[model samples]
Structures are given as structure tokens and as C-alpha cells.
Target: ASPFRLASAGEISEVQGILRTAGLLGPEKRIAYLGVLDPARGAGSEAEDRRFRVFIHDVSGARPQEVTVSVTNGTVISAVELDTAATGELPVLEEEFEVVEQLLATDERWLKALAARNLDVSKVRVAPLSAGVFEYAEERGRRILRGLAFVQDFPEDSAWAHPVDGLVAYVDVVSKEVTRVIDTGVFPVPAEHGNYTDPELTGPLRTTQKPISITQPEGPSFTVTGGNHIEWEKWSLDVGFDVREGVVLHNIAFRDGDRLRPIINRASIAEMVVPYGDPSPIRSWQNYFDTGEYLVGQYANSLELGCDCLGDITYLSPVISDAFGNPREIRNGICMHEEDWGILAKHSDLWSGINYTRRNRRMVISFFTTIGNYDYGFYWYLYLDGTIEFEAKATGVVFTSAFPEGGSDNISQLAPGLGAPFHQHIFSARLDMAIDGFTNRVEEEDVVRQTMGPGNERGNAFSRKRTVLTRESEAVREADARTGRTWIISNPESKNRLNEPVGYKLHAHNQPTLLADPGSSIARRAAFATKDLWVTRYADDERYPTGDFVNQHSGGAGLPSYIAQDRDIDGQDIVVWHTFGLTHFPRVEDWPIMPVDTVGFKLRPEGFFDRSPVLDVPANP
Candidate 1:
């Protein structure tokens, strides 16, 4: 039998003993079989809103117990313990951090940095201009130090011809001096881009759809991973001052291992297009074909079941299974973005922590600062064993990769899956469905094909599921890859390295069927349909496993994109990538700080198992 297997009563006892040995059930140390710790702002003022949650398990004897702990203070606000002897067996759930002290404390770096800067106060007039923060990478010797600061507003006037706003009038941590003077058009415009609607691509901002607010998939498409629990109680002044409420935390796991594979496969690959600063931009991630460059797809050519945003989500499964041969094939099996699966979330930064609490039947995701018009800034997706259960809270809107907007089309021209070419919007809800977790596959039966190099020696899977049996469990993968590239040469600060391969990818879509023949309104008729169906693959260029791909052109060194055939939509040259990174020595900074930043989606837990509860029992003896 496998060394990790536990069956009979003896095995169960052994497992319990092992857990105790691991100090999970110890008095001084409660063993939580959790994976990720996500961050969320507490209620009230900005200075007081420093709360977070730890998703994990309390008791792991009978059924896997799930619980959530608060950050500001170590209190188990909620818990759900298993009724080991209850007649009708039930899963356990609870919010525990309310009682238990948090493992990781506050980061002295951020606080110290801010305090160090605060001392050099250059008191001009502190006004509230823009309330968002900006980030950039600093070339600290050979290392890239990520720096972020909230831009303080200054008096809005023509004092500086260039669009110069805020003042660092405060003390600088690096220099520790109150540095404030006049600007000669140095800073660029902080005018935001998102939150604004490009209805043609991401559908109209508002809609009658309830869950449309969520950016992830929906219905059968989105699924909850875990959900069994027994109610438990706790008390603390952590969540807020004297706000002891009835809390329920459930241990759950989600797997789109089967359903999410193709979606990821479709979105994989980094294409390089030549002839930049020109009129005709590269259209669609598929257009990488015309470039004749070797491309490397997503890390594993698979969608992870881990936290796409904050690290509260844990994705488990090897990039390549060790079960088979030495030179293994890309099994691309099932993966779960579990609550507490591994170390990625454990070692991540506080900003990457996932914090949400459930009391009684009410679920509340705390909001620190209400930027724009929204209070809390977060998204919760529920997947029910391969199905989209429901979204908890999605205030801000996210755009889709389909539709006929932004100059060129992003949809596919090949066999279209969802014939509805019109942009479809997804939303979140206040009362989210209690995820009785579920599982599904990022299927690949109808995978798309893309040529990696000359002949056809190299290529990968792209687009996603070419077929959809039911909407409930089917996830919609993105078609166009809108990656961003820095103006390395143009931006003086980017002069650290020249000709150092500073580039980005894009999806320029233009069908000769439509491009070659404009009179054929059929291209116009099939615009949405074609735009929805992008064809590509996930398998790396090598078409095997273990190795990675790097797309490069003869003399290419810039970000390429498809400019609209008409001059209407210009300046969209800079592509925005939600998923960007190369696979190789994935580091702690990438693990913790996460490279300046970005967030788009998540992988959740499936609530149930085949017949019994999966992910329920603890480690086997």
C-alpha cells in the first residue's frame, strides 16, 4: 500500500497519533491543515482596518475541519468541528483565528519604511487627489527591489506644465529627507484606465445578471471545491471592537483540474511579433504564428488550483506527475486551488493574504479603503465539483477577452463554442452560495493548435474547450492575450539594461476573411463569433515535458500589437497582462512580494467527493 494511505480503525488511530505528533492538536500549538492566509481590510477607518483571515482545518480525525483565523489578533472567530459520533455524520467548519494567535506577525519592512519616510514631513498642503498607489521596480545593485507608495494629492494647478500631481513632501525611507519641490513635467498622468467600460469587448458594465459582477466563470462553469462542516463558536475583539458574532468556517477544496486545463492551455504561450511602432498590429494571441518565433507557454501549460490573486488559495499537484516514466509526458491532470495545500500561500506577504469571514449564515469580506465608489475590493468564486456555484462579493467590474471592441476582435474564427458573440459580463453577489465544494477538469479534448516555429516542429495548445456540454461546469477561458510591455528605450529610467530582451506579447486578431475582404460584412456578421473562438494550445513548444519555451525574433525587441484597421482605436499599443511570468527558479519575492503586482482570477475548492468526503481525512498513517 502507499506510505500515505490510511484505512481500518488501527490506521485511523495511527493517523490521529501522527497528527498529534505533528503538533496539530497540541494545546500550545493547534495543528491547522491549512494552505493559504489571505488579507482583507477590517471595518471602520483606514488606520484601524488591518484585518485578515487564515483558511485551514482544526480537527482532522473524521472529516476535514475547516476554519478561518483573523490577522490583527489571533482569534478563532469561526470553527466547524466534525461530529465524530453524531448520527448523521456532518463536516466541521469554524472561524478560529479569533481565538488562536496568528502565526505570522506584521511586516516591519512596510511599517518601518513608512515611518522612516513620515519623519521627513515636507508640509506643503496635503490634499486628496488620487487615492491609489503606484509601483515600480528599482535596480538596487543587481537585485530588483519593488517599491510602492500611496500618491498624496497636491494642489491641482498649472504650477508644473507637465501633469505633475503629488509631492513626496513626506520623509523618504531610502533618503530619509523631506523632499518636495516644483516639477517640470516629470511625473506622468495617473488617470486610471480600468473601471471604465469598453462595452464592445467586456460587455456593458452593468447588467441584470446577479453573478455577472464576478470576473471568473459562472454556473456549471464555476464550481465550489469544499463544504462539509459542524458549527463551532468563539469570541474576540479582533474583527472589530466588541464585535463578537456567530461565526462558521468550513474546510473546502476546489478542483477544475479537468475543466480548467484547456482554458489555461489556450492562454499559454508568449508570442513575439516584429515590426513595432507600425500601423498593422499583431492581432490575437494566435497571430504569434505569423511571427515564426519559438514561444513558451504558461509555467506548466495548466491552470493552477491556487490563489490567482492573494495566496489564501492553495493549488496542489505536480507540474508533471512522477507516477509514469523518467521522460514523462505532460499528464496535465487535476489540480486544486486549495485553502491550505502547500507553502506558496504560507510564505507569501500579508498583502497576498486572503481574508474573509462567515458568521452565522452571513459572509463579510472587509474593505479597507473605498477607492472609486466601492468599499471592499475583492472577488470570491464558488465551484461545485466542476461547476460554477456562485460569487460572494465582486464590486469592481472585470472585462472579458471576447467581443468586437478595442480596434480588432479577440474572439476565435475557427469552430465557435458559445455562439453568443456579444460580450458577456459576469458579476458577484452579497449572499454567496455556501460552497459545498466540487471538482471538474480544465478539459482538453478539443484543444486548439498553434505553430511554434518553422515547419511545425514546435507548437502548443491555445484557446480552450472547443466544446461545452453544460454551462454549469464549463469555464470560459480567455481568447486574446493582452500583455503589457514597457517603453524600455523611450523611458530614461529603464536604461539599466539595453537590448536585454525587454519585451511583451499580444493577441492581434484580423481574419483575412474579414481583413482581405471588407465588403464581406460576413466578417462583420461573424465578428463576435470569430472573436470568441481563438485557436491555440497549452503544450510547450517542445511538445513534451520538463523543458520551457522562449519566443524570439531575428531583430525584435519591443511589444507588438494590432492597431485597428481604422484610426478610431489607437494608442492601445501597450498590452496589459493579468498572467505574466516565466517558469524557472520561481523565487520567494515572486512567492511573497509578487513582483510589483497584478490580480485577475482564482482557483477554488470543490465541496464534496464521489460518495464520501474527499480532502476530509487528515494525513494517513
Candidate 2:
């Protein structure tokens, strides 16, 4: 019954008191939540049925609205009002950097430039500024809101080692006004001895103790029901959250022994781009679409248990929604665990000399975010044989800009005028297949190379080639790695047991794709980071690959206008879109904090499981 609950905080304050007693909210109209609305396909019936959509904002009407309401058993049957626009998704809420740092601390010339740099508007940290610079003023279009000031003597530690350098501010989020200030005289490399929790600031580490642990002892075999239904062993899914795709998942079954197997009905990430090679005008509009103008799950970050996961973790809590429609929760915003994935199968028996090994267990689910100097994370795994992975990682602090005292040749210094530019990050994801049931199809393999006419001489063999990909404009491709391509998603009536068919493939490790400039504007609003895979034809409102109105958006809707109606994606009900990441360049050990950098892929299970699905487990003694 529970197809993923969440809507309670007493059902979002009873849908905000039934839209503020039907006047649709107050003082210039409000409500902004936007989530909890997935009922319809045979409509939820019970599990305490639900609905909630929020997003109204008529602050004296310029544009933007949506309602949706519904609820059930705790009543409030309908609220309705749909008509929308202004989804310029600018979500950087947490009282938006404390209301842009209390309007830059009641600026009397920003407290005389923080009393001429003795600096301490309570150590000042403030963040936001991803795409911050919208301007069109007077017939209504403000949104400037920039800010990337830092300087801290431990204002709760981590100010990314004091980067205030040259200052920068610009506010006006609907005229909360700070308006403009630039500074540029350069002067900030104090690094306060770059304290990383002071183990005497980066000392001692020329070798390792090599420690990593993960035990189960009959503990986490995974189940997790109400806290968003996870499951494990044979996998199951349904987790949600999305102030623009940050950890979505949904339905995704798998089992197969007794045969549950649906595969993805939703998966996410769905956007991210980072783009920065610094062609100047302040890093050339820096590109950055970190989940469309910032909302990486509205800056998730809570994780922390043995510092962001070790075994035996579960945690979920993510309700989010504020800048006033109030819901908030977010603790440990998703974590789940179980690991030790090493060798999942090994066997030796030179005439029954007998030997066997089995280890690999996996199950992850993660979430992290931050986005203002990076933090990212993501993950998703599952593997006990039929793999699934998806990773991301990246770890924070490397957006340093402010150069010129001696860092010109376009940029790439890291310290001593700190330019550090060349960037890429990318990401993307979507997915949505229902592989064992919803028609499915896609194909596109490609290994090629063995062309020794009729198999006589062995010309360093290789041969996969396959193709299919019916439409969605010939299945938009990319990711060659010299013809190692990939992409599968089958179910042409599902086969298995060597009859073949029944698929899942999509390997894509460290993909990379977009180097921008296809007609730049960050490659026309990131056209799904210019392809690594895309299939399309499964619109449940085509869940974003950049185009759910990517704030200040420009290039036509997402996935190049949803595959420009290239429609007919083979057997239908499809969706795919993968695109992975990495292109970073910044070094100086990526400064202050940056040691993750992942970006993975993998779906596996091509003949779609008929054997070795963990080969009757139980061997990790």
C-alpha cells in the first residue's frame, strides 16, 4: 500500500490549512513545497492515500502558480488551481543564506568593508552564486543574488580556508536588496594554515594503515519499509525527494526467483553540469547547472555517522521545502548501507582439488549534495550479482576564482592568485525502464574490430556490433572509448537461459561527454550534457535532463527538446539517458578538501539472470 509515503507534517499542515482557508494563501499569496504527487495510475486506494503539490507564489502577481492538494483519510479532498509558469527553480533555501547574510549584515558599506578587513561579521561565510546574475530590471526580472564571500576563524569550521579574496556581492532576490559591490584589489591567501581539523594541519601521512570494514553478522540484510521502502537481497526500490531530482528512485523491482522483476520505473540525478574553463568575464558566466541553478536537493548534507557512513547505517529523513512553504526535515537525508563487495564468485577444481570464494555483497543508496564549492556524492548500488551501481562522489572545495596578481594565462593556479578553472563534472541519469514488462528495447552495443573476412586469420578478435535502437532519432548516442559503446535495456518479451534477449547492459564508466560550445550557452542549456546515451519515449512528463525550466533557462526544453519528437523509441515505454562525468583539472591536491571524484555506471545482467544471481550465497565466513 505504501508506494512511498511522505507528505505528513500532518500532511503538510493540512495542505497549508487547505490553502489558507481557500483564499489560496496570504500576504501576497505563498506556498512553495512542490512534491508528493504521484498517485494516478490506478490511483493509490490506501496506505493513507496522498497528494500535495504546492508552488503558488503571487507576491503581487508577476507569474508562477500550481496547487494540486487532495489528501484522503485526514481529509482535504481537492484544491486544484494548476496553471503554471515561473518555475524558475531558484532553490537555495535555508532561509537563503540566512537571508543573504542578514542583507550583508545591515551594510553600512558592508560594515566599512568588515571594518576594513579586520573581518568578522561574525566570521562571515554566506554562499549562493551558481547562476546568480539575472538582471532585466524594471518591467520585473530581478534575481541577481550573488555572493561567495568567506573568511572564518572557525565559524563552525570550514570556510574553505578563508577565501574572501577581492569580495563579491550582488543581491536583490525580489528586492531584498544588496545590489552591487565588487572589490577586485585582490588580497586573500591567508589560508589560516588551511586547518583540516588540525592534525597539525596536513602533517604525517607517508604510508597507510589500510583499514576498511563491513560486517553483517546477521544484521543488515536490508528491508526498510516505511522510511521509503528499500528491500535488498533481490532488491526493490522507491525513495523520493526532488526539489529537482536529487535521490529519486521509485518502484524499480528485481527478485526473479519467484519472479518480481520490473527493473526501473524511475531513477534520477537527472541534471548537473559545472562547466568552467574560465574564458574570463568573471570566469565566463561560469556555466554551472548544478541541478539547474542550484538545488542539489536543496543542499542536502546531513549524513555523518563515522563521517558519512560505515556499515549498519540506515537514516532517511528528507522532507524539505522552505523559503516558506515550510516542511523541512532533512536529517541524514538518505543513507542505507551494506558493503564488502569483493569477489562474488570464484571456483577452482583441477580435478576436484576443490576451492571456492564468494564475498561481494552490496546495497548502498546514498545522498549528499552541498554544491557551493562542491560536495556531490549520490551513489545507488545494489549488486549481489545482478549489479546496478551509479555513483558520482566529487567531494568539495575547488571553485576558487580571483586571480591576476600572477595567474593570467587563462587560469590554473590553485594557490598564489588561485585561479583553478578548467572544469566539467556533468552527470545526468533519468532511466525509467520497466525492463521486464513495459515494452523496452534499445540495443546499440558496438565492439567491432574482427574483420578478417570469413574467420580465417585471427585479427586480434573483437565483435559485438548489435544495433536496434529503433527511434528517438536513432537513439542519440556517444561515449565511444574507441568503439566499446554499450546501452541495452531489453525485454523483447524477455528471454534468459541462453535464449538471450532479457537485458540491462549500460556500463558507461567515467563517461565525460560535454565539453560545451556546441552553440554554447553552456551548450544550449546543457542539452543533457551532449549525450552519452538517451532513449526516450516514456513521458511521465519526461522527468528532466535539463528542462523542467532550468532556472533562467534558455535552450528549448530538455534532452534537445525531448529528442525532438523523434518518438517511437523501439518497443516503447523506454526512457534511458545516462551521461556520466569528470573533466576536472584543478590541482594543488585539489585544494583544502577534494578527494572523492568518482562518477561510475553499470547496470549489468544482460541475459538478465538465470544463474549466478549470487550463486546461492552464504560463503563469507
Candidate 3:
């Protein structure tokens, strides 16, 4: 009955066995990703409706396939080979990377190209990166990732520090061959050792700062049940983790009086794209769809107590499938705890000569996933006063490239010749809304300066404006800081004491969307991130914002395609997809292991409550 819990190891093993026996999985086929096919509507209210969605990559045929199977019934529901042209190409798995690495080890041109720069071929890694929409023959119609060379002095060294710019090797995993190697004039490799773990290179550790320890002296206030279901104070929700989107929150509700008001049906970060701004041919195709193409969730950190989280934290261990369809349990995949969030509400009444205040404690749930050169964490917060916040922390190493010696360039110059290019970490957040129930609508609110007419004759006046977005196409909106814009998801049928629709406002940080050229290949593929917010008619099949496959997609598959249906959304079951992120122009401070750059937005209850919900809480003594 635990719908949000991840598929057990036994269930996944059974599915893999059935698929293998069905000739749907084998030595030539690898799993791109596999998980419970997120339960259909009204799932837990009935019979066993559990099913698993298995995405398969046919390396032998260079085809992507999907299979849905029911574990309880032990039968395959449906299966098909996805068109490579349509889905572009599936994500490059470890098995594919193995072939690329081995083929590069024997390629004569790749070896000569490395030796030409006087770099040790044995000390380097030919990282297979997704070849973005390149019209080259070797990169077309094949399971190929462009090989970029990075030197690692030792096995544990960080190769990202010593980028071998200007040389590229295109290798096909299926063919087990190197398609081509291009040398675009070599540049000097960074002479300084890039690894920071060596104490010798880092010098003496600092001792000036005092330790600030966090602990839940007595115990945590939250309780977790049925594996993934968690509750704290007046809030409760079901949690789920996936290979694409980790830490999914479902059936989120807040208890008011005796009513458990449904605020969100389901919510999770659907996808995120990071694209670089170094225009050179050597790095122009440097965009990464971290969630879809890389399966970053699989690289989630096994968090250490007191270090990763400093409190009485509760952790969740989730199972993920390897390329061979084997389930692997990752410990501490999700962390949950509470933080002191300052004052929830306070008042020092001058007239009454009395002061009233309440402590703002918040529940925090988070997960950190490493995607190659960078690290990203999805942090969620539930405040006592009906406010939900989602913050994304981006840290880890900045992708490095070398510039000409003694040539001064302003493009994020980190070291003497090391340059970290400008990039954007754009995220797509999916919010399946229920407001108070299933009937909901959205209103785009903007603060506008009122003209000096009859009501505003003094000319110093502003009025709040609201526009009802009736359909999907009309609801495709952008954030406006000048106008102080925000989109409110309201249930038209539900009304509060003031006769206003029960609503919640989604506040935007007004972050820049995808900065790629409109006609560029990345523009179409990352189209979901172009707009600040999108409201669509809720559908069971419509889940991922970037379609289902985004490994090397040409363009126009996700949001752009979804909105084309132009379904009516007003006063209907709707979902909000908000795009938010961090645009970074890296500085010297963002070197080696960069500090966390935070970006996020907040959601607050507007007229959902009749009065201040936390006013009656006792003061923290």
C-alpha cells in the first residue's frame, strides 16, 4: 500500500528476469533507467495497480526502447523501440562508455594526437560527452559521445583540472571503433596539480573559524512511516525517488482545524539543463541536460552524518538500476531534518505596550547528486506558516579550459591560463496542483502603475492586476521583475472567509531561462526552460518536461510539444511547470571545489487560510 516507496530489490530483480526471458533484455541491451511507473490517478484507493517502466538502450541496434510491466501479474504490458531520429539517442550508459574508452585506447590517431601535444596518453581520460546536434557523419545515427581528453596524473587525480583543449575523438559504442579524431591546434596543459585532496598542494588547514554544531538535543519532531511517508507538525506527504528526478513529494497537505487540505498532488524537479557560453568550436557544444542525459540521480552522494547534515537527520535509502538491470541500494540518498527559520511572525505593539513572537521552525528534505564536474542538491523546506520553499545548491568543480599564454581574457579567468566559461544551470520544476481539491485555475498577477484617471488623480498610485489564463497556450508566461509578476494557482470553486478563491502564489526569482540562440539546437531541446512558468491540463502520461528522452534530442519535444495541444486549463485539473536557475560567470573563487551557489523560489498560501494559522502556537522558551 506504500505507493511512494521505491520498487523493492526483489521486484526489480523479478522484472529484469522477466524481461530477459522475454528477449527484451540481454547482453546487447542495457537499461537506461528503470523505476515504478509512477502510480496512476487514485492509485492506493484500489487493487494492486503497480507497474514498472523499463527504458532499454539497444547498443547492438543503436535503438532506444521502453517496456512497461506489472510485477504483481508478472506480465509485460507494452514494449516498443523508440525512433532514434525522434528521441535523438538514449543516454550513454557505462557499458557504452566502456566501449568508447577501450576503442580510444587502441585508436592510432587518438594516441598520436595526444603525443603531438606531448601529453601522456596513459595518464589521460577520453571522457565521452554527448555530441550535441552536430551534423557530422560520425556523430549521426549511432550511439556515440564525443571524446574530450583530460589528464589525470594518478588514478585519484581530478582530470577536470588538466583539460586537453582542441582535440576531439568521436567514438561509437556499438561499432566498437573511433569514427574520427580532430585536432584544432593544441594549447598548453595546466602545469599546476589540480587535485585538492593532496594536503601538500593545499598547504596548512585554517583554524581561525570556530565550529557551529547543530543538534536536535532531545529528538526530531518528524515521524516517517510506510517507508517514504513523512509527517511533521501540521504537514504530511509521501516521498519518492527516481533515477531522473530524485526526492519526489506526493500528496502534500497541511492540517487546518480537522481538515487535511490538499495543497499539491505531486511535485518534483522534472529536468535541468546546463549550457556553456564559450563560443569556440572546441567547446561550443558544451550544453548538458544533467537530469535526462546523465541520470545524475544515480550518482547521489552517500551523505555522512554531522558532515553533510548537521542535525538529528533521517535518511532514506533508495534502489537504482545499473546498466545491466541490477538494482543497487544507495544509502542516505535523501536527508530530512529541521532547521531554525528565524521568526515566523512577530509584533511589538507600541500602542498596547505588548510584544508577541513565535519561532519559525522548518522541515528540510534534501538530496545531493554529483553530475561529473558539478554537484547539485535539491533542498525543500516546509515552514510552519504555510510556506514551501525549494532551493537548488550548485557546487563542485567548474569545467576548465586553457587560454593562450599571457593573453588576458575576461571569460571567467580562474588561474593564469585556466578559464571557466559562463554557463546557466536551468531547472524545470513540476507541480501537480490540487489547491484545496482537484478543480483549479491560474491567474497571472502583475503590479501596474495606475494612470492618473478619476480614481488615481494624484498620479502616485499602483494597482494589482490579474489575468486569467484560460488555455495551455495562453498560460505559457514569463517572469517580469519590473512589474513584480507572480502566478497564483487558485481553486475557483473553493472560497475563504473573505469570499476570495483559495489560492497559493508561486513567487519567481526571475532567473534567466536558457540563453542559447533561439534557432540553435539546444534552444528546441531545452525549450521547457525558456519560459518562466507554464500551466498545462493535467494528464497521467505527461510527466517529464523534456519529453521522455533528451540524450541528444534535436529539438521541440517537451514543453513546446505539450502546449501545442492547447487544452483548456481554467477551473480544471492543472499542473504548473516553473523554470528557475543560476546563470554563472565563474570567478577565481569558483575554482577547484567551488562554493555553493544557491537559486530558488517560494510558494506561499494566499487566501487558502481564514486567518494566521500559527498565531495560537506557544512561544519558544
Q: Which is the leading candidate under TM-score?
A: 3
- Top lDDT: which candidate number? 3
**Model 3 TM-score, 2 decimals:** 0.97
How many clashes show up per model? 132, 0, 0
Off by over 4 Å in 2: 1-13, 18-34, 37-48, 51-70, 75-94, 103-242, 246-264, 270-400, 408-420, 428-432, 438-455, 458-461, 465-480, 492-510, 513-579, 582-621
Task: Evaluate model 1: give its lDDT.
Answer: 0.21
Candidate 2 residue lDDT tens string, 156-212: 676755666666666665557787666655565455435565677677755766767
Cα-based lDDT at residue 496, candidate 2: 87
RMSD of 1: 25.8
Candidate 2 CA-lDDT value: 0.71
What lDDT tens digits, residue by residue, belong to model 3 across residues 285-323? 878888888877778999999889778999899888888
Would you list the C-alpha lDDT of every candidate in the order shown? 0.21, 0.71, 0.84
For candidate 2, give the lDDT of residue 119.
81
Which runs of model 1 end up more than 4 angstroms from their true locations? 1-182, 186-250, 253-375, 379-441, 444-477, 480-621
Error of 1 at 368 (Å): 5.5
